[PDB]
Design a protein around this ligand. Structure first.
Ligand code: NA
Lengths: 100, 275, 9
């Protein structure tokens, strides 16, 4: 059966400024089937209060979701998105680069 | 300008873990306005835009009644399709349905759609004439013939040309501030040095609505399609969208490169340069 | 507004 790998982008809602509140987003898109595991990490550890958008899909039937959490960026804290899906042999971790 | 309304439905079977998961969402243009999730506690259709929150209980009760009925037909569909493709009872499968309508810039009916997919592949679609069906699979022919005999296309054409566009026009008027708006992209560039002999120039468009945008790089006015890295347009989470495009610029050549931005919210297309 | 008539594949 059809399986399509998720594309992953990890980014903030607003340009990041240390000490100013924001949202950290992990957008997963282009994937099939819809079962997917998405965690947001702060310094390696799973963030607990993470919400997501309602499942929807593109013209080619592939799904997309936005996972998101409130955060206040600092100079030292590192953020990442960690994704597992049937198309990925191991969880894929994408680091937040305050520039992508 | 032109506008659309779309409803998207996904049902996923969970053999041995109870009833299939059913999720419905509705959009006007690029703005979600309603959702239903079978696993959620309310069991109601719920608002997801501020302009639909004032519709009132007849709207909410009737949309809840209809969306639950869509969930039950998909539940039956998963069993029907398993039968058609001779699949076992053990595996999880996915049915998706989309329907809705487009209006042109005169707000008159332009096009309607009604289509299904099974396990990620086209299953059956209503053609543009709203009278006939495209089915690729041998299994989908059974469905096509059933729908021809029951005159499903006639029923859908009535809805797509009448009800669908009339409610789109209602939504557009009631949500005029949210839906008839454009947010122009706020733009900037970043410059990061790969090595000593070249650097990455990235052109950003942020906080725009609707999602449709063209970001391109030129070098001496020549398009650099092959050599531009583009990311998919992505939601900011607040109802606006973001995108970037990057090129690799050899040393001393920044002034050769222009980033071009087209968007309905701009009074004029932008030409940006690192300088 | 949703379509109101049941459709079964
Ligand atoms: Na996996």
């Amino acid at each position: 059966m059809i399986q399509r790998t998720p594309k992953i982008q990890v980014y903030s809602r607003h340009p990041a400024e240390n000490g100013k509140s924001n949202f950290l987003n992990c957008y997963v898109s282009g994937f099939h089937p819809s079962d997917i595991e998405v965690d947001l990490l702060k310094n390696g550890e799973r963030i607990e209060k993470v919400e997501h958008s309602d499942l929807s899909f593109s013209k080619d039937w592939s799904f997309y979701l936005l996972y998101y959490t409130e955060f206040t960026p600092t100079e030292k804290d590192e953020y990442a998105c960690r994704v597992n899906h049937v198309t990925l042999s191991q969880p894929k971790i994408v680091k937040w680069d305050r520039d992508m | 300008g032109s506008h659309s309304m779309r409803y998207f439905f996904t049902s996923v079977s969970r053999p041995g873990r109870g009833e299939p998961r059913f999720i419905a969402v509705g959009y006007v243009d690029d703005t979600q306005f309603v959702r239903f999730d079978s696993d959620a506690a309310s069991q109601r259709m719920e608002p997801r835009a501020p302009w639909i929150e004032q519709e009132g209980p007849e709207y909410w009760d009737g949309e809840t009644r209809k969306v639950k009925a869509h969930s039950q037909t998909h539940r039956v569909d998963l069993g029907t399709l398993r039968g058609y493709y001779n699949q076992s009872e053990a595996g999880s499968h996915t049915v998706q349905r989309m329907y809705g309508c487009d209006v042109g810039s005169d707000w008159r009916f332009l096009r309607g759609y009604h289509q299904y997919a099974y396990d990620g592949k086209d299953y059956i679609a209503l053609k543009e004439d709203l009278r006939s069906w495209t089915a690729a699979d041998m299994a989908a022919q059974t469905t096509k013939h059933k729908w021809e005999a029951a005159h499903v296309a006639e029923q859908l054409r009535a809805y797509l040309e009448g009800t669908c566009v009339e409610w789109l026009r209602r939504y557009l008027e009631n949500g005029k501030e949210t839906l008839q708006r454009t947010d122009a992209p706020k733009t900037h560039m970043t410059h990061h040095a790969v090595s000593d002999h070249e650097a990455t120039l990235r052109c950003w468009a942020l906080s725009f609505y609707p999602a449709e945008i063209t970001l391109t790089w030129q070098r001496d006015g020549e398009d650099q399609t092959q050599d531009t890295e583009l990311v998919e347009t992505r939601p900011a989470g607040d109802g606006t969208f973001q995108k970037w495009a990057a090129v690799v610029v050899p040393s001393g050549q920044e002034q050769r490169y222009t980033c071009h931005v087209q968007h309905e919210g701009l009074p004029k297309p932008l030409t940006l340069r690192w300088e | 507004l949703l379509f109101g008539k049941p459709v079964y594949v």
